[PDB]
Amino acid sequence: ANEGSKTLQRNRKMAMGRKKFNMDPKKGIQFLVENELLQNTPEEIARFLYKGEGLNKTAIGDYLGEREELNLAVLHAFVDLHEFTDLNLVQALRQFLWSFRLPGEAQKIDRMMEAFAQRYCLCNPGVFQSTDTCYVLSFAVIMLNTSLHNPNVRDKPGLERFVAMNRGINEGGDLPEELLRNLYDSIRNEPFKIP
Incomplete structure (x- = not known):
């Protein structure tokens, strides 16, 4: 034509x-x-x-x-x-959760977050030795964002509460407290922008 x-x-x-x-x-x-x-x-x-x-x-x-x-x-x-190399978990989550809006159905979210966790660990080999630690901590960060920034959640967890809630998940040990602190502060100072 x-x-x-x-x-x-x-x-x-x-x-x-x-x-x-x-x-x-x-x-x-x-x-x-x-x-x-x-x-x-x-x-x-x-x-x-x-x-x-x-x-x-x-x-x-x-x-x-x-x-x-x-x-x-x-x-x-x-x-x-x-691309998640050299990004901390919060930075990588901000980027991922901006590219689409998560479905409501728990089974769909599970597939999506598992795929995220796998990518984050492949891109940052030293940070988490288990993809289960990454998955669990990703949901911890998402929930912390709701707790700190949603006015309906009265009594927002402090850093010490956030540290204690995540004990034992790093192959039986704990994650470095400096990591937990950096994630907590990043979320305290800047809420996730959800599309």
């Missing part, structure tokens, strides 16, 4: 695919793939969602939380797009 026309038609179909995605993620991806606007590979779908241009963060999280094989592969590729 002709180049200018084809480009303009493609750009509007792309805009349509975004709206479709935002109503129903699987249908949006289907429209873009069938119209040759997106390659149907786990990494190309993950880059598309990571860019997130005109996409609702809730719908990104909904797609990433589906149980079928391709969605799990896209989730793993999406987490691999995040």
Whole structure:
């Protein structure tokens, strides 16, 4: 056909695919793939969602939380797009929790946080020797953020309470108190921005 026309038609179909995605993620991806606007590979779908241009963060999280094989592969590729080397756990969490909004269903959140924990540990080999320590401490940080910054939680845990709540999780030992302190202060001073 002709180049200018084809480009303009493609750009509007792309805009349509975004709206479709935002109503129903699987249908949006289907429209873009069938119209040759997106390659149907786990990494190309993950880059598309990571860019997130005109996409609702809730719908990104909904797609990433589906149980079928391709969605799990896209989730793993999406987490691999995040660079976490030399970031502390809070810095890495701020970045991750901004790229999409977590689904409500506990089983979907579990898959997503497990994938995060694996990426953080692979990127920072010295920090946590167990992915279970990273997973548990990630939820501790998320809950601390709610406790310190939600006015409905009366009596916010102090640093000593936060240290004592996490004893025993570092392969039977404790995490360095300087690590716990730095995470606590980072959260006290700057709440997570949730999309």
